[PDB]
Ligand binder design. Sequence first.
Ligand code: 402
Ligand code: SF4
Ligand code: SF4
Ligand code: SF4
Ligand code: SF4
Ligand code: FES
Ligand SMILES: [Mg+2]
Ligand SMILES: [Mg+2]
Length: 575
Amino acid sequence: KTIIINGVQFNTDEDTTILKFARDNNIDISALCFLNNCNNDINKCEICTVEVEGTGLVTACDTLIEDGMIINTNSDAVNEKIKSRISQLLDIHEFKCGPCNRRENCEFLKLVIKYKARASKPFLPKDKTEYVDERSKSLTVDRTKCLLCGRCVNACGKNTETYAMKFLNKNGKTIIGAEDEKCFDDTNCLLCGQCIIACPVAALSEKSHMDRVKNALNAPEKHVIVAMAPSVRASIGELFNMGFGVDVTGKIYTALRQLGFDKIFDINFGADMTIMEEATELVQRIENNGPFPMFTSCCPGWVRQAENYYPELLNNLASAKSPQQIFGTASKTYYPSISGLDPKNVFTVTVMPCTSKKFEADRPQMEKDGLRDIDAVITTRELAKMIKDAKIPFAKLEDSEADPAMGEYSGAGAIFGATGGVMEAALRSAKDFAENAELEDIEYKQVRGLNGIKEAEVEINNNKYNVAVINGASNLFKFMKSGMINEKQYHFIEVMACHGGCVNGGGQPHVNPKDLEKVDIKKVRASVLYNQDEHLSKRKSHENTALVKMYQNYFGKPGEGRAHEILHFKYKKSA
Ligand code: 402
Ligand code: SF4
Ligand code: SF4
Ligand code: SF4
Ligand code: SF4
Ligand code: FES
Ligand SMILES: [Mg+2]
Ligand SMILES: [Mg+2]
């Protein structure tokens, strides 16, 4: 093929789109609705308009290059077409970037500025209440920002295959929303927030818990614990311009203290707890020769998927609470016993890469004696906003350490946030537990990485066992519907609803789709976690000294009695 673009001749054998070819050759073509290798098939945004001599104006994102094509990306006709589309989008867009939560990284604003577009009539609703949906415990919608680009719909389809995000005909107008325009929580939605990650503007957001947190912090009698997820320390730096793949663990501990939190712990402590309980259960099942398979239960997106699509597997889930809720449980029981705090005055806050965690924390039965395991959950993005509002110079902060009692963690706990992390961590303990040994080879590289479905054969006490790692909600559907689960007897299966694991969670920093072209965000965020594991002295959950003391002095033997009654949670199907 010979192609001419803006007077420049190219010779190529490639079969690809105008958009992809131009960008591979440093030619600028704007786009909006094209993402995840899909555009909006009905009602295309046409921001990728280019001119093909002989043909006219075409959409570059879904038009293949052809031999003999003469292309102009920046002619008068092209720019006025694009400007006109943006102008029309402004006509249905509350253009008020001041108090907008996407002010600093909005795709639409950048386009508006680039083409100097203006609305034919500014959209200024007086009563936004009919445009906003805040019913969900996890997600919120503000349709005064929505461009109807379909990016959330395609991402839901591609990441989960549930199609819980749909186009709807509402009062004769097109919107996006859940089936029947119900609250997402009341549908098959996983509350995973991949739709939010896909959104170019502030139409989709997390359900805020920031007011819960600020109120607890300012409440005189409240003692506010905070603990961040594995993934946060590998990610939040992005939002302070520190680059990608930067370990900012110590800076976070420092920032949290400056925010006024009363105790700094870590969810990775909770991860080690979950392994204590879950590895014990795995060994138990092995000894009882069943039931198999056991599934992880730490991902609330997967739990909702099981509840909504495979309720028969609910009994197969590990009874151990997630690191979040198991941590919380201990924060209202164990922690008062070593601090003298009144349990009622403890207010437990987590920082998560996840929107689904908010729903998990607000489950009615996730409490004991009237005390919630977890009182608030803020996303990585929310914590970043609190830090900036407080004018804390994050990139300049000196490192501090966590408070040790529920703050220490092993390398096993640290890798939880990557797909295959829970699996690897769990095997390191299950092998030691079952063989009554302290084995030296602890790295299970076979369950790592971005393959959608991963399997391995493991030898535990000189018997062979089959494990699988399901990487993404759509891959759980594939695993089940394809019958792959029946090709052999699986004994232990990890499921994460977000591809890449929690490092790619719905509460994570948005990433410029151009930076995404340059950076493997799932691998670079994960690399921070495996790096920590590499350099930690303790690399098994049961070698966590603060945790061992907690079990020795308070809970007793894991997976049994006191531990079972308090630290476990079983999901049940309808009769
Ligand atoms: N609870 C919990 Fe987890 C832990 O530890 C997080 O905090 Fe995850 C992360 N990062 C999230 O969100 S949940 C799914 N299991 C893997 S990691
Ligand atoms: S979504 Fe973007 S363009 Fe719209 S008000 Fe917010 S920052 Fe401005
Ligand atoms: S939260 Fe997840 S399952 Fe629900 S609509 Fe968004 S992408 Fe789909
Ligand atoms: S919510 Fe966001 S991603 Fe979905 S159609 Fe509206 S602007 Fe596009
Ligand atoms: S994979 Fe992690 S971030 Fe994604 S829904 Fe599950 S727990 Fe949340
Ligand atoms: S980016 Fe090509 S039609 Fe939207
Ligand atoms: Mg298409
Ligand atoms: Mg206070």
